[PDB]
Structures are given as structure tokens and as C-alpha cells.
RNA sequence: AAAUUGUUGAAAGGGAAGGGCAUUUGAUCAGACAUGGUGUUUUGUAUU
RNA sequence: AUACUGCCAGCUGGGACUGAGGACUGCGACGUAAGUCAAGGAUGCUGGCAUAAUGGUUAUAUGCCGCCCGUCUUGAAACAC
RNA sequence: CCUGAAAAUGGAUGGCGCUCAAGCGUGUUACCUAUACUCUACCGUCAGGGUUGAUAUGAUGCCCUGACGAGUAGGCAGGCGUGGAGGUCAGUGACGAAGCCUAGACCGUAAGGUCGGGUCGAACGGCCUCUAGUGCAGAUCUUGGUGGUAGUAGCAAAUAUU
RNA sequence: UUGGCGGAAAGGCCUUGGGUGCUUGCUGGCGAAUUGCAAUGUCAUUUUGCGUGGGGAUAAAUCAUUUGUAUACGACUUAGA
């Protein structure tokens, strides 16, 4: 054979991790990110669309909406590093925002077995989006051209330099 | 998939081939150090093939580990599987090339019963 | 930045323009150079003619058909200057010279398109006033280029057509300005002015 | 094997300039062709769809002689015989078909994009 | 609009190199519109993509992407240094890369 | 067996070829996922 | 006053590379004080894939680089053997 | 700066080219990049140390710490292979040993080891030691075999054949 | 569809008129979701092949023979229903 009998024996117990000292602390967003601020979504299926920033969510996300009746962006969350803050501000008072958070944005992800070789929204979500968009529109109409601006998708023209540009 | 170890880093995954083994058929690829007085490889000129050095040595925490993290152990029978019986996460069995077909299926069955991983559970089997 | 950049070679110093264009071609820019007969080189005509004669003296002794090929057209002179500054023996340099195009006068694909200049290569900006300079067409004729008269004739024809076009453009511009004078100075013009435009 | 052989007008048909007329080789090859045709007839083949599917001549053991050179020297005088083999086959149409399935692997974003394009474009 | 682009254009100039030795691990990128380091500072840390097309379809697309990031500024002329998860193929000297506006700090 | 050669197949081939670093493309291939474990929809009706 | 210089155990931002170690022990900080911490080495949240996608090998292409080994020799790619 | 200033293949501030320079002299910064320096990981070497639990681990074990690493001629060390020998694996094998082929996989910095597939048909290997006719790229090395040259030089003296 | 212009590499630029689509010049109604917090998230061609339906016209070159204004051989003047 290879060996008769090993006099020296190793151990298979899975070592416990040391007591790490990384205590999480709340995120500090940039000053330009305040609720009721127009944001250009830089990525996703809604890239370049101008939405309204509503609330800072628990998992470092940003609760935004189009409004849906304006540009078609539903009540979603987006990453704060994939939007551009814009100087345009829309008042947020009169709009309820405490309802939505990470538990509201649940998915119940489909199984690994269910393969989409060939291959709907919840009534509560559509209703609360209707209410939130109604309040947002009621406030938005007080500023001219805001609805048209929020419907228009942002884009980079030829000769547009982002490092000199202001939003 | 096994005991907590650093990723297996291969500092030099390329084979160290002898100088001019491509130039001449009589020069085999087995590495030999150039002892020539004017040798560019021995003098380590820019653009020439690298030579094996101790600095290429693998991390001692991952040396001899398979891609799966086990250590290969050549076996020839169930008695050879016995020494691995209780170290399933650290060693894997490799049935010797000259084991006959029936003894190979015997070893494979015992390793399957005992949870031991075999690196070649496909030899002498229909494909 | 642009698909193709077309440079009016008139009034440009050949070496500065060739350095600029070589850098652009290696950076990935397609470039067309026109009016290569109107390119400039600093120094007197006799000086640069002697320089070209020193160039001509060099040829492979045992077979002149192997030696340096001394091209005579101003466009080919500029191309040689630029090939000197591109590493033309590698595939990257071959691709850069494939991106470059240079002509005498302005052929039909480009007399209808905008032509740019390179201020860091323009003689009027770069040369100190009073310094002598040569014109590549004159030098090329002196060293054996056979089409200075044809190029000048076609250039006069193209210039006549382009001057007619410019007169038509000025007429259209004056008419639109005079007709939109009324629509101007309106409320929308006031808002655009107060908001910058 | 044509270095320093002469040119001919009959190489133009094949795009070359160097061609020759190896009478002995041609006789051997057509004798073997007749043998193969007889075998195909014995096996019951078309004999008109037959085409030379395989042909292969390689070197055989050399037959040795000697030649005599100035200042009392001996050199080799070698024949270069050939093993010739060939196979004639019945010509056939495009037999190979049924290409691969090419089962696709897509992500969630790709699946959603495909669903949206299906919904929008008919 | 007919313009949908959400990125800045850039050119992959070459590798990081001395006169006679290059380093394929670090590429040099010229962001089109930038001519000074003080203006290149905006693009520090932004993502870069080299998007090419291959005739063979892999995961439902014939388009392949290699991702990277702007690490620092290079020189006096607005060129920056970029690093990619895979080194750029070196056939792409003077090819077009997409400098996205994320991760954003505006 | 090798040198050397034929055929077939695949690639490259603007005055050599071969090599190193690095990626890309084509080809090819190894490496967790039923498995000691989470508890119930007991499939091919001591066991999952 | 400003400039120039020196200092700050001054403040506020944008980037990049790294995350070795693996129960505790130590030195410290925090309203001193039950406890928490950025204090003797990265954790937390999330997503897609789970397959040649990453990776390995191989052939090519591209950027840069790369003279033919052995030998005698102060000196060899040598028009030295 | 110019004259002085003439050598033989065509020709070299490296080349293109450059003229308020991309020249010369001198100041000021910014920037580029060595196998150098700083910090980090990993390898080895050396050094200094710690460690007697009845426990399940052979104390040249398990650890902590720091500094180092160019190399011909040369010295020493630790190892990898080959033939044969003593022990042992009550080792592998006609249900296929050895050998060979395989831009297949794994392991080792490497010498190399292990395995998948094809071919083959009778022996062979791991480990602890012993032993040597023990490792090749060269020696105008030896013997055998084979090439390019190359379907090439050539097969033309002595009258001549039909 | 109409009238021109453009030979430098024109192969493009103007122009009369009849249809049809849109128009963000101003004001509306409806849809967007779920690609789940980003993944270029596939929208431009350069060629080729295989077919479909609407037209259009039904050759030569080489070998072999000949020639000798030609010729080492190829190649070349030539002729040949």
C-alpha cells in the first residue's frame, strides 16, 4: 500500500471564526439626496428616467416612484449610487411614506427547479402606488413643466460634458 | 466545500519547459537548468523563459490540495480506503491504474458507502 | 470624437500637422487631409529643395527598385512624413495608416463637407513673422511632380462652385433672419434670453 | 515533388505551370483502379456513382543498388517503391442533418426583457 | 428621443508602459471631452465597459462585455488609468469604451 | 518508439520559424449542490 | 490686512489596492461605571448563475519584448570552434 | 551663426520631422516609469524563542517572532529518477502486468509522480533499507536508422541505325 | 412623379407636383410595474449561403492541331467548323 498506519493524526473540526469587530453603522447619504428630489436613474430597466425620491429604506436603498401615472416607474427601490441627484425639488408633505420598507419589498423567489424554458402585481401595491402618485401629482402640478420633465427621459447629447454639467 | 482554508492560489500555473525543447526534438520538455556560460536563460535576460524558483512555492495551507480541496490518495483496495475512512473532507481516493475492473467496482462501492470521494470514478466503465 | 475629420492642409506646417494626425490615427480617429499641395515647411525653398535632393540621393545601390521610394506628390510627401511618426511595420501602425487618407486639392467626396484646421500646426500662428517657408506644391513641382496645373485648374473650378454655394447660403440666411425678425423678440425669446439662450 | 522540373502548357487546366506525364505511375494507378472497380462490381456497387474517395501512396522499403564514383567511391542507387492503396465509394447527397438543440441559459433580466418584448411586439 | 446614450465615450489608448515594456494589467483611457486632470477627477472610480460582438451566442446574446473601473489620472492631459476584470485584448488600442456615470456622487 | 513520410481534419502563411508577459477568439476539459445536514409533496409503494 | 514659512494629538470630501489571522486572553476609548466600540488583521445586506458563465489547457491573433546553444575566452549572436 | 570644413555602396541628433523650435543657455512647476524604496500577502533560508495534556497524535511534532533571498568557477545540503539486493505491503495483474501512443485531468518551484482513453499480452509496483556498469544535447562521440538537397546532378568518348 | 446640377475618385446635391404617417406649436384621456437594487442587457452593419416572387441575355477560355513576325521550357505573332 501507500502507508501502514498514520501515527500522527489531523483534525477535521471546522474552526470557529474569531470575534470580528465590524459593527455596522448607519449610512451617511450625500446632502443632495433629500426626499422629494428628482433623480435620473442611471441603470436598470428604467435607465435615464426621472423619478421622485421618497424615503431612505432600511437596507441602504432609496424608495422612488415615477410617479407611475407620469413616466411608468412603479414604487421601487433603487441603489443610491446608481442615480444622479437633481436640483429640482418637489414637496413631500401631504404624502404618506412610512408604509413601505424592506418587508414591503419582498419577492418569495422562485425555485431552482422551475426553469423558464418556455415561460400579476398585488392589489395592495397598486392601490398604495395610486394613492402615493395622487398625492405626488397634486403637489407636482404646482410647478409648471414638472410633469413633462418627469415624463421626458434623460439622455447625453453630443457635446454634453457630465463633469461640467449640473443637474 | 471543505475545511476553512484560503483560496488555492497557483503562483505559476504554466509548465516550466526546458530551453529549446521546442527547437530540437532530442531536447525533451522535462525541465533542465541551463549551465552554459553564455546562456540567456541562465543569465535571466528579458523576454526569455522563466526558471523554477522557491518563490513560486505554493501556500503551505493549500499545498497538495485538489481543486476540490481534498488531497489525492492513491488506493488499490478497500484496505487502502480504510486509512481515508474518517478524513473525508481532507483526502480523496484515486484508484490505481492497474486495478482490474471487478476490484475497481468493489473499491468504488466501498468508497460510496463510506462517503470517500474518488477522483476517477469513471475508469474501465462504459461511456 | 468624430467619424471622419477632414483637415484643410493649406497653411499648415507639414511636421506639426503630421505629428498631430499620427497621434489621432493611433488614438483611433479617421482623418482625411486635403490641399496637400498647400502645406508649408519652414525655411527657404532652396533649403528644402536641397533637403529633398539629399533624400533623392539615397537608393539601394545594387537595385534602385528596392531602395527608398522617393514619392513626389505633396500628398505622398505628407504621407511619408506621417509614416515616419507611425510605427508602420506593426499591425497597429498599418491600421493607423489605413485610417489616414490624404489628397491634392479637394476631391468630390470632401468638397461638399466641412474642413477643419489644426491651430498648433498652422503656419500663421506657429512661425515667427519674417521666417521663410516653402509650399509643398512648389517643392513637388521642382522635384518632379507632374500635376500642379491640373490641381490648380480643378481647384479654381471647385472654388467657383463653392463661392456660388456660399452666396446662396448667405442669401438664405439673410432671408430667414429678415423674415424671423418679427417672430423674434417675442415672449419665448425673452424667456430664452433670461434663461441663457 | 516538383522542384526543377520543366513547365508545360497543360498545367494551366489546374492552375500550375509544372506538370508531367508519369507513365509508369499512371499505369500502376489505373491497374489498381481497375482492381477496385472489379471489387465494387463483385460487391454490387453502382460503378457510375463510384468516385475515388480515398487514395494514398507512401514509401515502401527501398531497393538498394550501388553506383561508382570518381576516386574509387561507392554511393547508393536506391529505388523508391510505393505502397498504393485506394477506396472507391458510391457518391451520396447531403446525408448529415439534425443540428444541435442549442438549449439556452438566460438570467432574470434576460427573461424579463424577452417577456416585455413579447408583450410589446407581436 | 433618438439619443439614448447614458455614458461618456472613451478611447482605449494603450497599456501602461515604459519605452520598451508594457503592463497589460493597467490600461490608459482618454475620456472624450476631458483635456486636464482637474476635469478627469470627476471620472475617478466610475465604471468602464468594453462592449464587443462575437459571432457565437453564449448566454442568449452575441454581445460580450468586459468591465472595469477608473483608478486614477494619468499625465497632464486628462488621460486616466483604468483597470479591468480582464485585461483589454490589445487589439482594442483606439477602440471605444463606455464610461458610465455610476457609481455616482452627484 | 523516434527521426522521416502519405492521407484526412483543424489552423496560421507581405523577406524565416520558434519563445516570454498579458488578454481576446475558437476548440477542449476538471472542479458544491440526492450526498454527514434543514424535516414531511413517503418517488421505481430496517426506510425518505 | 495679506503674502511666505512653520505647526495643529484641525475639519470636510473623491478615488484605488489589500481583508493575512480564525473561541477567549492584550493595550485602550466611550456619560468612568451595568455595556458598547473604528481598541492584538472584513464584516453586513443583496443580486444573477449554478453552467463551460469564472477558470485550466491548447491553437491563433494583437501590444511590447526575445540573436544559437555548448565551449575556450578580458570579451561570442559572431565573419571563432 | 557663418568661412576655414576634402573619400570613396545610400544614410542616419535613433527615425520622422522641428525654425518666437521639437535648437542653444538659464529658471519654475506638472507629469511618465526600474527586478530600486515604503506597505501587504505568499515561498524558502537563517536566527531567536515558546511548548510535558493521563487525554488522539509519533517534541528534528505543534507553534510565536524578526531579518534576509543576484551569482560563474567552486563547496555543501535536501530531494527526484534507473538496474539489481534484504524486509514488508498475506501489494497490483490474463476480469489484462510491463511497454508504447494521447495540443486529456490532478499534484510538486522542479527533478518528476498519479490518473482517464487507445494499443498490448505476462509480469510488475509502494514503503524501510542495501548496492551500482545509475540519469546525456553536444565529445569532426559510437552503432544503426532517416532526411532536406532531389525526382535534382546526371545516364553525352569508341560514326548508326531503319 | 417633375426639372436640373455634379467626371477629380462625379455615385451625390438641389427642385415642381400628387398620396400617406407623425407632429412636443397649445390642451387632454388611457398604458407602463415583476428585468424585482445594476449587469451593453442585445435596436448599426460587412459579406456569404439557401429559398421565394417579378423581370432580362442565351458566351468564351484553355488543352489538342497549326503557325514562326516567337521561343531553353513556359510564354508568345498567327490559322483552324
CSV table of N, CA and C in Angstrom, one decimal, chain A residues 30 32-33 40-43 47-49 80-86 153-164 167, chain E residues 1-9 31-35 38-43 46-47 99-106:
chain,number,residue,atom,x,y,z
A,30,UNK,N,-25.3,61.5,0.7
A,30,UNK,CA,-24.9,62.8,0.4
A,30,UNK,C,-26.0,63.8,0.6
A,32,UNK,N,-27.2,66.1,-1.3
A,32,UNK,CA,-28.1,66.3,-2.4
A,32,UNK,C,-29.3,65.3,-2.4
A,33,UNK,N,-29.2,64.2,-1.7
A,33,UNK,CA,-30.2,63.2,-1.6
A,33,UNK,C,-31.1,63.6,-0.4
A,40,UNK,N,-32.3,61.0,-11.8
A,40,UNK,CA,-32.2,60.3,-13.1
A,40,UNK,C,-31.6,59.0,-12.8
A,41,UNK,N,-32.4,57.9,-13.1
A,41,UNK,CA,-32.0,56.6,-12.9
A,41,UNK,C,-30.9,56.2,-13.9
A,42,UNK,N,-29.7,55.9,-13.5
A,42,UNK,CA,-28.6,55.7,-14.4
A,42,UNK,C,-28.5,54.2,-14.9
A,43,UNK,N,-29.3,53.3,-14.3
A,43,UNK,CA,-29.2,51.9,-14.8
A,43,UNK,C,-30.6,51.3,-14.5
A,47,UNK,N,-33.5,53.1,-17.0
A,47,UNK,CA,-32.4,54.0,-17.1
A,47,UNK,C,-32.7,55.3,-17.8
A,48,UNK,N,-32.2,56.4,-17.2
A,48,UNK,CA,-32.5,57.7,-17.8
A,48,UNK,C,-33.8,58.3,-17.5
A,49,UNK,N,-34.7,57.6,-16.7
A,49,UNK,CA,-35.9,58.1,-16.4
A,49,UNK,C,-35.8,59.0,-15.1
A,80,UNK,N,-28.6,54.0,-4.2
A,80,UNK,CA,-28.3,55.4,-4.2
A,80,UNK,C,-27.1,55.8,-5.1
A,81,UNK,N,-26.2,54.8,-5.4
A,81,UNK,CA,-25.1,55.1,-6.2
A,81,UNK,C,-25.3,54.9,-7.7
A,82,UNK,N,-26.6,54.6,-8.1
A,82,UNK,CA,-27.0,54.4,-9.5
A,82,UNK,C,-28.0,55.5,-9.9
A,83,UNK,N,-28.0,56.6,-9.2
A,83,UNK,CA,-28.9,57.7,-9.6
A,83,UNK,C,-28.0,59.0,-9.5
A,84,UNK,N,-28.5,60.1,-10.2
A,84,UNK,CA,-28.0,61.4,-10.2
A,84,UNK,C,-29.0,62.3,-9.5
A,85,UNK,N,-28.6,62.9,-8.4
A,85,UNK,CA,-29.4,63.9,-7.8
A,85,UNK,C,-29.5,65.2,-8.7
A,86,UNK,N,-30.7,65.7,-8.7
A,86,UNK,CA,-31.0,66.9,-9.5
A,86,UNK,C,-31.5,68.0,-8.5
A,153,UNK,N,-37.4,61.3,-20.8
A,153,UNK,CA,-36.2,60.5,-20.4
A,153,UNK,C,-34.9,61.3,-20.6
A,154,UNK,N,-34.1,61.3,-19.6
A,154,UNK,CA,-32.8,62.0,-19.7
A,154,UNK,C,-31.9,61.3,-20.7
A,155,UNK,N,-31.0,62.0,-21.3
A,155,UNK,CA,-30.0,61.4,-22.2
A,155,UNK,C,-28.8,62.4,-22.4
A,156,UNK,N,-27.7,61.8,-22.8
A,156,UNK,CA,-26.5,62.5,-23.0
A,156,UNK,C,-26.4,62.9,-24.5
A,157,UNK,N,-26.5,64.2,-24.8
A,157,UNK,CA,-26.3,64.6,-26.2
A,157,UNK,C,-24.9,64.7,-26.6
A,158,UNK,N,-24.6,64.8,-27.9
A,158,UNK,CA,-23.3,65.1,-28.3
A,158,UNK,C,-22.8,66.4,-27.8
A,159,UNK,N,-21.6,66.5,-27.3
A,159,UNK,CA,-21.1,67.7,-26.7
A,159,UNK,C,-21.5,68.0,-25.3
A,160,UNK,N,-22.2,67.0,-24.7
A,160,UNK,CA,-22.6,67.1,-23.3
A,160,UNK,C,-21.5,66.6,-22.4
A,161,UNK,N,-20.9,67.4,-21.5
A,161,UNK,CA,-19.8,67.0,-20.7
A,161,UNK,C,-20.3,66.9,-19.3
A,162,UNK,N,-20.5,65.6,-18.8
A,162,UNK,CA,-21.0,65.5,-17.4
A,162,UNK,C,-20.2,66.1,-16.3
A,163,UNK,N,-18.9,66.3,-16.5
A,163,UNK,CA,-18.0,66.9,-15.4
A,163,UNK,C,-18.3,68.4,-15.3
A,164,UNK,N,-18.7,69.0,-16.4
A,164,UNK,CA,-19.1,70.4,-16.3
A,164,UNK,C,-20.6,70.6,-16.0
A,167,UNK,N,-27.1,69.1,-12.6
A,167,UNK,CA,-28.4,68.5,-12.6
A,167,UNK,C,-29.3,69.0,-11.6
E,1,UNK,N,-36.2,60.3,-27.1
E,1,UNK,CA,-35.5,60.9,-28.2
E,1,UNK,C,-34.7,59.8,-28.9
E,2,UNK,N,-34.1,60.1,-30.1
E,2,UNK,CA,-33.3,59.1,-30.8
E,2,UNK,C,-31.9,59.0,-30.2
E,3,UNK,N,-31.6,59.8,-29.2
E,3,UNK,CA,-30.3,59.6,-28.4
E,3,UNK,C,-30.7,59.0,-27.1
E,4,UNK,N,-30.2,57.8,-26.9
E,4,UNK,CA,-30.4,57.1,-25.6
E,4,UNK,C,-29.2,56.9,-24.8
E,5,UNK,N,-28.0,57.4,-25.2
E,5,UNK,CA,-26.8,57.1,-24.5
E,5,UNK,C,-26.7,57.8,-23.2
E,6,UNK,N,-26.4,57.0,-22.2
E,6,UNK,CA,-26.2,57.4,-20.8
E,6,UNK,C,-24.8,57.3,-20.3
E,7,UNK,N,-23.8,57.2,-21.2
E,7,UNK,CA,-22.4,57.1,-20.8
E,7,UNK,C,-21.6,58.1,-21.6
E,8,UNK,N,-20.4,58.3,-21.2
E,8,UNK,CA,-19.5,59.1,-21.9
E,8,UNK,C,-18.7,58.2,-22.8
E,9,UNK,N,-18.2,58.7,-23.9
E,9,UNK,CA,-17.4,57.9,-24.8
E,9,UNK,C,-15.9,58.0,-24.3
E,31,UNK,N,-10.9,59.9,-22.0
E,31,UNK,CA,-12.4,60.2,-22.0
E,31,UNK,C,-12.6,61.4,-22.9
E,32,UNK,N,-13.5,61.3,-23.9
E,32,UNK,CA,-13.6,62.3,-24.9
E,32,UNK,C,-14.4,63.4,-24.3
E,33,UNK,N,-13.8,64.6,-24.3
E,33,UNK,CA,-14.3,65.8,-23.7
E,33,UNK,C,-13.5,66.3,-22.5
E,34,UNK,N,-12.4,65.5,-22.1
E,34,UNK,CA,-11.6,65.9,-21.0
E,34,UNK,C,-10.2,66.1,-21.5
E,35,UNK,N,-9.6,67.3,-21.1
E,35,UNK,CA,-8.3,67.6,-21.5
E,35,UNK,C,-7.4,68.0,-20.4
E,38,UNK,N,-7.7,67.9,-13.7
E,38,UNK,CA,-8.7,68.5,-12.8
E,38,UNK,C,-10.1,68.2,-13.3
E,39,UNK,N,-10.3,68.1,-14.6
E,39,UNK,CA,-11.6,67.6,-15.1
E,39,UNK,C,-11.8,66.1,-15.2
E,40,UNK,N,-10.6,65.4,-15.3
E,40,UNK,CA,-10.7,63.9,-15.2
E,40,UNK,C,-11.1,63.5,-13.8
E,41,UNK,N,-10.8,64.3,-12.8
E,41,UNK,CA,-11.1,63.8,-11.4
E,41,UNK,C,-12.6,63.4,-11.2
E,42,UNK,N,-13.5,64.0,-12.0
E,42,UNK,CA,-14.9,63.6,-11.9
E,42,UNK,C,-15.1,62.1,-12.2
E,43,UNK,N,-14.3,61.6,-13.1
E,43,UNK,CA,-14.5,60.2,-13.5
E,43,UNK,C,-13.7,59.2,-12.7
E,46,UNK,N,-15.5,55.8,-11.6
E,46,UNK,CA,-16.6,55.4,-12.5
E,46,UNK,C,-16.3,54.1,-13.2
E,47,UNK,N,-17.4,53.4,-13.6
E,47,UNK,CA,-17.3,52.2,-14.3
E,47,UNK,C,-17.0,52.4,-15.8
E,99,UNK,N,-17.8,54.9,-20.6
E,99,UNK,CA,-17.6,55.3,-19.2
E,99,UNK,C,-18.9,55.7,-18.6
E,100,UNK,N,-19.5,54.9,-17.7
E,100,UNK,CA,-20.8,55.2,-17.2
E,100,UNK,C,-20.7,56.2,-16.1
E,101,UNK,N,-21.8,56.8,-15.7
E,101,UNK,CA,-21.9,57.8,-14.7
E,101,UNK,C,-22.0,57.3,-13.3
E,102,UNK,N,-22.0,56.0,-13.1
E,102,UNK,CA,-22.1,55.3,-11.8
E,102,UNK,C,-20.8,54.6,-11.5
E,103,UNK,N,-20.4,54.4,-10.2
E,103,UNK,CA,-21.1,54.9,-9.0
E,103,UNK,C,-21.1,56.4,-8.9
E,104,UNK,N,-22.2,57.0,-8.6
E,104,UNK,CA,-22.4,58.4,-8.7
E,104,UNK,C,-22.2,59.1,-7.3
E,105,UNK,N,-21.7,60.3,-7.4
E,105,UNK,CA,-21.6,61.2,-6.2
E,105,UNK,C,-22.3,62.6,-6.4
E,106,UNK,N,-23.2,62.6,-7.4
E,106,UNK,CA,-23.9,63.9,-7.6
E,106,UNK,C,-25.4,63.6,-7.3
